[PDB]
Design a protein around this ligand. Structure first.
Ligand code: SF4
Ligand code: SF4
Ligand code: FCO
Ligand code: F3S
Ligand SMILES: [Mg+2]
Ligand code: NI
Lengths: 262, 545
């Protein structure tokens, strides 16, 4: 029995789309991952234990002799001592901070943990923050709402076998986030010819014209969507809808209105 | 053996509730090994309704979709129906068709994942699978369920061999401190059945990926679809032969698995836990309906849903009433909200957070308490199943009666945690049986004419409501537009109905009621609380938003 690297996975202020994204991995499939590659030692969405038994699994993981890597899903609600986001009776910020202190590394899966996400959008009633801001430490950000399983599992595998991958100014691995969506879009030739759709019901839209005029944030969004696709079959623009730019920090307030460039 | 129950008298708190979406704390008072009082306490607030204020109504679906990534899509759909209604546009037949097929795919993905990856661990002792003779398991499978190479001795020995090495590694990972470790009186299944269920659990992990790819052919990506727009859908490619052929092929693969593995594992489990047919029932059921032939308005949705809408009160299957949207309201008296918010119709909804303290019995949840003429309503597969059965929906009548015959129980036994679980499988099987017919209808329609989005105008002032029956049940979005911007936007979500706290009269919610009478074999490992809570398929991100 060769030892598998311990991974602790925390859920804070989140919708769980990130967990769901990760289990759409096919290279490799999630069961081969956690049976052969890592030791997923805490993951509330799928773990057998509950309550104190679950809280004891976490603590057993955190006190592991071999140490652990920390994955974080969700932003951190900080209003009122952090009480608006609790697990086992403890503020989420408190548990994330405690887990972060000894982690070999922190990977933030999704735009919420990386940057704050949807709950941070104005007027931010829970005073949510991204992990790195709330804890004051650097994170490996895998943003996207949610990010492609290719990017996360890619990062995780890298962090266990190679080290920290090269990161852009926003903490994003350049292996996955080094090119704009727009530059790998098949509708680029339309954008270059000023061949836009002015509405979704228009003939232009039927012909597959560029969606820039309908608010596509592709030209300002770093991600690999058109190159890798999702679910091995599709991506938003291929399905005729503009990019929201869901992998950019605070896009909820920098990319809206979504159907405009305004 | 009769139902194991201890003599325990005292409190039990389970926090966190794992294997659901979101952050839930359950507190019960137990007496002589039976639950006598219950609290459902939701533990995270995000506040999407507050964030939406003053924004562009067109943007709503994109924010509200992130109420939840497990029931991904469904809020985008409800928001889109809501705005469509506020601007008074009727989407084209092709959009109705595409949007509903995306809902069908979501049910398939969601229910399959729930039974195996969230729920089964309360019923299946994974470690017991190691005591099984694989050859005996094969013979067992091959004797009760459909022939398949995944159930052969070789397949089962290979699963048991993987599980054995994992266990012997000392790193149990997600099975760490499981309630079934070392045996548990509440776990009844023989080791041969555990091995089979476990083999399927691993298979389901691969199959849910395919269920997700199919959905993505139409929805653009999964999680979090990106194909709906005000007035319809943007995905013209979704109307074309090649994509639709692959969608059908993938869906047939998923459905083969539902019929070969899910339903059989479900019936086998229900067979062993027949006693759970008498634990965890409630009395009132609500659905808005889904899979409508006419989605031109909420009225038409309510009236033409192929999974029909309605309201049942006091377990009376003889009196399915029409849904009165004006009769819905939400209380916050037992919730962490500011005083004055009780009894609000969602068009007048108010979301004013006000936290007190942990386990304050006066204010103990971040969910509102939605009520229907003063009554708590259970929503979800079981609600749909009883309404469809009551009304004689042919597919439901046939499948439910099939299940009642295999289990040798009467229909009233379905008012229970076991009913609730079995209901989820029933509708999956029905959705499966209709996919090919639904795919043919859009393929034919699309080919003749590929209109997918209609023209519309943003009104200065207006209001509208989007209804859906998501996998967890009756979902509604409610918008007030003013100055062409969002003046109020309120979500009232299936898990808000099921798992909210008490209403203003101090009346328990469906999950709280269902918990009363729960037997506890071992207070240290109260898996019976999980069986019931998980059967409601809770989503607290959905519940509280
Ligand atoms: S990044 Fe998006 S998909 Fe992931 S948890 Fe946040 S809201 Fe959900
Ligand atoms: S559709 Fe979007 S990403 Fe594609 S070429 Fe146009 S602006 Fe760029
Ligand atoms: N299904 C689902 Fe999610 C919940 N509750 C929604 O809507
Ligand atoms: S919305 Fe997000 S998933 Fe890719 S297409 Fe735009 S970055
Ligand atoms: Mg609400
Ligand atoms: Ni949900």
């Amino acid at each position: 029995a060769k030892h598998r690297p311990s991974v602790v996975w925390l859920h804070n202020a989140e919708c769980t789309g990130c967990t769901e994204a990760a289990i759409r991995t096919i290279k490799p499939y999630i069961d081969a991952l956690i049976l052969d590659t890592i030791s997923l030692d805490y993951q509330e969405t799928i773990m057998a234990a509950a309550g104190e038994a679950a809280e004891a699994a976490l603590h057993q993981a955190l006190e592991g002799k071999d140490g652990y890597y920390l994955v974080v899903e969700g932003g951190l609600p900080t209003i009122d001592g952090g009480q608006w986001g609790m697990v086992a009776g403890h503020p989420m910020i408190e548990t994330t901070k405690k887990a972060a202190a000894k982690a070999k590394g922190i990977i933030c899966i999704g735009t919420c943990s990386a940057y704050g996400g949807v709950q941070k959008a104005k007027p931010n009633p829970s005073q949510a923050k991204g992990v790195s801001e709330a804890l004051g430490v650097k994170t490996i950000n895998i943003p996207g709402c949610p990010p492609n399983p290719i990017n996360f599992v890619g990062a995780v595998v890298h962090v266990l076998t190679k080290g920290i991958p090269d990161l852009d100014s926003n903490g994003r691995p350049k292996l996955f986030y080094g090119e704009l969506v727009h530059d790998n879009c098949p509708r680029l030739p339309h954008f270059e010819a000023s061949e836009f759709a002015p509405s979704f019901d228009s003939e232009e839209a039927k012909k597959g014209f560029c969606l820039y005029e309908l608010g596509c944030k592709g030209p300002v969004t770093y991600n690999n969507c058109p190159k890798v696709l999702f679910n091995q079959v599709n991506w938003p623009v291929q399905a005729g809808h503009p990019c929201l730019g869901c992998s950019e920090p605070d896009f909820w307030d920098t990319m809206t209105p979504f159907y405009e460039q305004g | 053996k009769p139902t194991p129950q201890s003599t325990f008298t005292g409190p039990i708190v389970v926090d966190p509730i794992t294997r659901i979406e979101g952050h839930l704390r359950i507190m019960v008072e137990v007496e002589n090994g039976k639950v006598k009082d219950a609290w459902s306490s939701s533990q995270l607030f995000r506040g999407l309704e507050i964030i939406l204020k003053g924004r562009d109504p067109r943007d709503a679906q994109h924010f509200t979709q992130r109420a939840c990534g497990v029931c991904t899509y469904v809020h985008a759909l409800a928001s889109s129906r809501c705005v469509d209604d506020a601007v008074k546009v009727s989407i084209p037949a092709n959009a109705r068709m595409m949007r509903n097929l995306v809902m069908a795919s979501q049910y398939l993905h969601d229910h399959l994942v729930h039974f195996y990856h969230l729920h089964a661990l309360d019923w299946v002792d994974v470690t017991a699978a190691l005591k099984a003779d694989p050859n005996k398991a094969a013979k067992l499978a091959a004797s009760i369920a459909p022939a398949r190479p995944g159930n052969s001795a070789k397949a089962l020995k290979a699963v048991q061999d993987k599980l054995k090495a994992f266990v012997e590694s000392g790193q149990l990972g997600i099975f760490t401190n499981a309630y079934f470790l070392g045996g548990h009186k509440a776990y009844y299944l023989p080791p041969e059945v555990n091995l089979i269920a476990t083999a399927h659990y691993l298979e389901a992990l691969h199959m849910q990926v395919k269920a997700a790819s199919a959905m993505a052919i139409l929805g653009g990506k999964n999680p979090h679809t990106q194909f709906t727009v005000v007035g319809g859908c943007s995905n013209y490619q979704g109307l074309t032969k090649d994509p639709l052929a692959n969608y059908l092929a993938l869906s047939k693969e998923v459905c083969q698995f539902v019929n070969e593995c899910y339903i059989p594992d479900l019936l086998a489990v229900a067979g062993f836990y027949k006693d759970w047919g008498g634990i965890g029932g409630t009395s009132n059921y609500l659905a808005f309906g889904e899979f409508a032939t006419d989605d031109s308005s909420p009225s038409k949705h309510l009236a033409t849903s192929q999974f029909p809408s309605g309201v049942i009160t006091g377990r009376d299957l003889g009196k399915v009433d029409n849904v009165d949207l004006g009769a819905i309201y939400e209380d916050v008296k037992y919730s962490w909200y500011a005083p004055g918010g009780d009894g609000k119709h969602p068009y007048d909804g108010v979301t004013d957070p006000k936290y007190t303290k942990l386990d304050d019995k006066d204010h103990y949840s971040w969910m509102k308490a939605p009520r229907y003429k003063g009554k708590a309503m259970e929503v979800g597969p079981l609600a749909r199943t009883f309404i469809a059965y009551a009304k004689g929906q042919p597919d439901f009548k046939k499948v439910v009666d099939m299940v009642l015959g295999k289990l040798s129980v009467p229909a009233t036994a379905l008012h229970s945690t076991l009913g609730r679980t079995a209901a989820r499988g029933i509708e999956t099987a029905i959705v499966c049986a209709n996919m090919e017919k639904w795919i043919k209808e859009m393929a034919d329609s699309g080919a003749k004419d590929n209109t997918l989005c209609a023209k519309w105008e943003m009104p200065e002032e207006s209001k509208g409501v989007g209804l859906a029956d998501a996998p967890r049940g009756a979902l509604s979005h409610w918008i007030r537009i003013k100055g062409k911007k969002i003046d109020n936007f309120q979500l009232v979500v299936p898990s808000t109905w099921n798992l909210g706290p008490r209403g203003a009269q101090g009346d328990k919610s469906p999950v709280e009621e269902a918990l009363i009478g729960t037997p506890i074999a071992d207070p240290k490992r109260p898996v019976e609380i999980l069986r019931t809570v998980h059967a409601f398929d809770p989503c607290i991100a959905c519940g509280v938003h």
